[PDB]
Write a protein that holds these residues in place. Structure first.
Motif, mmCIF file in Angstrom:
data_model
loop_
_atom_site.group_PDB
_atom_site.id
_atom_site.type_symbol
_atom_site.label_atom_id
_atom_site.label_comp_id
_atom_site.label_asym_id
_atom_site.label_seq_id
_atom_site.Cartn_x
_atom_site.Cartn_y
_atom_site.Cartn_z
ATOM 1 N N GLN A 48 -5.692 25.864 -38.893
ATOM 2 C CA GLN A 48 -6.962 25.418 -39.467
ATOM 3 C C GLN A 48 -6.858 24.044 -40.135
ATOM 4 N N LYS A 49 -5.684 23.422 -40.044
ATOM 5 C CA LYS A 49 -5.514 22.038 -40.475
ATOM 6 C C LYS A 49 -6.468 21.171 -39.655
ATOM 7 N N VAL A 50 -7.278 20.358 -40.328
ATOM 8 C CA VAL A 50 -8.190 19.463 -39.624
ATOM 9 C C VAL A 50 -8.190 18.052 -40.197
ATOM 10 N N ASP A 51 -8.137 17.095 -39.285
ATOM 11 C CA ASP A 51 -8.209 15.700 -39.625
ATOM 12 C C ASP A 51 -9.679 15.329 -39.504
ATOM 13 N N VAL A 52 -10.277 15.043 -40.649
ATOM 14 C CA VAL A 52 -11.702 14.778 -40.730
ATOM 15 C C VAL A 52 -12.107 13.538 -39.911
ATOM 16 N N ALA A 53 -11.153 12.634 -39.697
ATOM 17 C CA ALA A 53 -11.365 11.426 -38.882
ATOM 18 C C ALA A 53 -11.494 11.720 -37.383
ATOM 19 N N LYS A 54 -11.217 12.961 -37.001
ATOM 20 C CA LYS A 54 -11.436 13.392 -35.628
ATOM 21 C C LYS A 54 -12.747 14.177 -35.571
ATOM 22 N N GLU A 55 -13.463 14.173 -36.695
ATOM 23 C CA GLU A 55 -14.803 14.728 -36.779
ATOM 24 C C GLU A 55 -15.790 13.628 -37.154
ATOM 25 N N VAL A 56 -17.066 13.866 -36.875
ATOM 26 C CA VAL A 56 -18.119 13.057 -37.467
ATOM 27 C C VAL A 56 -18.574 13.758 -38.745
ATOM 28 N N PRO A 57 -18.876 12.979 -39.800
ATOM 29 C CA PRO A 57 -19.026 13.549 -41.154
ATOM 30 C C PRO A 57 -20.088 14.656 -41.248
ATOM 31 N N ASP A 58 -20.957 14.754 -40.240
ATOM 32 C CA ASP A 58 -22.015 15.762 -40.233
ATOM 33 C C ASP A 58 -21.470 17.141 -39.854
ATOM 34 N N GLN A 59 -20.545 17.178 -38.895
ATOM 35 C CA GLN A 59 -19.926 18.445 -38.491
ATOM 36 C C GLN A 59 -18.824 18.861 -39.466
ATOM 37 N N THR A 60 -18.175 17.874 -40.081
ATOM 38 C CA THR A 60 -17.311 18.118 -41.226
ATOM 39 C C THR A 60 -18.108 18.815 -42.318
ATOM 40 N N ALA A 61 -19.297 18.292 -42.591
ATOM 41 C CA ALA A 61 -20.174 18.898 -43.590
ATOM 42 C C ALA A 61 -20.486 20.323 -43.178
ATOM 43 N N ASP A 62 -21.029 20.480 -41.979
ATOM 44 C CA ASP A 62 -21.420 21.796 -41.515
ATOM 45 C C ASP A 62 -20.245 22.770 -41.594
ATOM 46 N N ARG A 63 -19.072 22.325 -41.158
ATOM 47 C CA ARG A 63 -17.873 23.166 -41.199
ATOM 48 C C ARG A 63 -17.495 23.604 -42.616
ATOM 49 N N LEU A 64 -17.546 22.690 -43.582
ATOM 50 C CA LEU A 64 -17.194 23.029 -44.965
ATOM 51 C C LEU A 64 -18.318 23.793 -45.683
ATOM 52 N N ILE A 65 -19.559 23.452 -45.359
ATOM 53 C CA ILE A 65 -20.694 24.207 -45.876
ATOM 54 C C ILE A 65 -20.583 25.663 -45.410
ATOM 55 N N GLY A 66 -20.215 25.859 -44.144
ATOM 56 C CA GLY A 66 -20.005 27.193 -43.605
ATOM 57 C C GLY A 66 -19.003 28.006 -44.407
ATOM 58 N N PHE A 67 -17.891 27.372 -44.778
ATOM 59 C CA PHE A 67 -16.846 28.038 -45.579
ATOM 60 C C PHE A 67 -17.367 28.406 -46.952
ATOM 61 N N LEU A 68 -18.127 27.488 -47.552
ATOM 62 C CA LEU A 68 -18.653 27.683 -48.905
ATOM 63 C C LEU A 68 -19.695 28.789 -49.003
#
Ligand SMILES: [Ta]
Ligand SMILES: [Ta]
Ligand SMILES: [Ta]
Ligand SMILES: [Ta]
Length: 124
Positions: A48-68
């Motif tokens: 589950q290690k993820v490099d946020v630079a291989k994401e666009v900040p919107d899906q990074t958001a969605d991914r972390l919002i999902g966890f929260l």
């Protein structure tokens, strides 16, 4: 604010992180460094290690919002989409807020996520 910084930083120095971050090194992080940090906090907690630079900040958001949402975070901002966009831009105050709420209790969150994961350690 500052009490929050020292709280987050002290909590990163404890398990499950046990990592020594200087008060300055923490404050010197921009939006992308903060999103990465939140991402790595979540990765430390649920095995589950993820490099946020291989994401666009919107899906990074969605991914972390999902966890929260799973762990029941009540954002200060009561507009889901205002939160979404604040998380995506890596807004400082918003990120300090999440980290301050999430980082303490990582020990408790890791324990609960670890539970039933390994054959040798059933939920029983
Ligand atoms: Ta751990
Ligand atoms: Ta682990
Ligand atoms: Ta772990
Ligand atoms: Ta349990």
């Amino acid at each position: 604010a500052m009490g929050d910084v020292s709280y987050i930083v002290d909590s990163l120095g404890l398990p499950p992180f046990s990592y020594q971050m200087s008060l300055l090194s923490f404050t010197e992080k921009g939006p992308q460094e903060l999103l990465q940090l939140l991402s790595d906090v979540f990765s430390t907690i649920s095995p589950q290690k993820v490099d946020v630079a291989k994401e666009v900040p919107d899906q990074t958001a969605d991914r972390l919002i999902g966890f929260l949402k799973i762990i029941k975070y009540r954002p200060n901002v009561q507009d889901p989409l205002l939160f979404r966009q604040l998380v995506a831009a890596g807004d400082r105050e918003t990120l300090y807020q999440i980290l301050r709420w999430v980082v303490p209790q990582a020990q408790l969150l890791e324990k609960r996520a670890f539970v039933g994961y390994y054959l040798s350690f059933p939920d029983m």
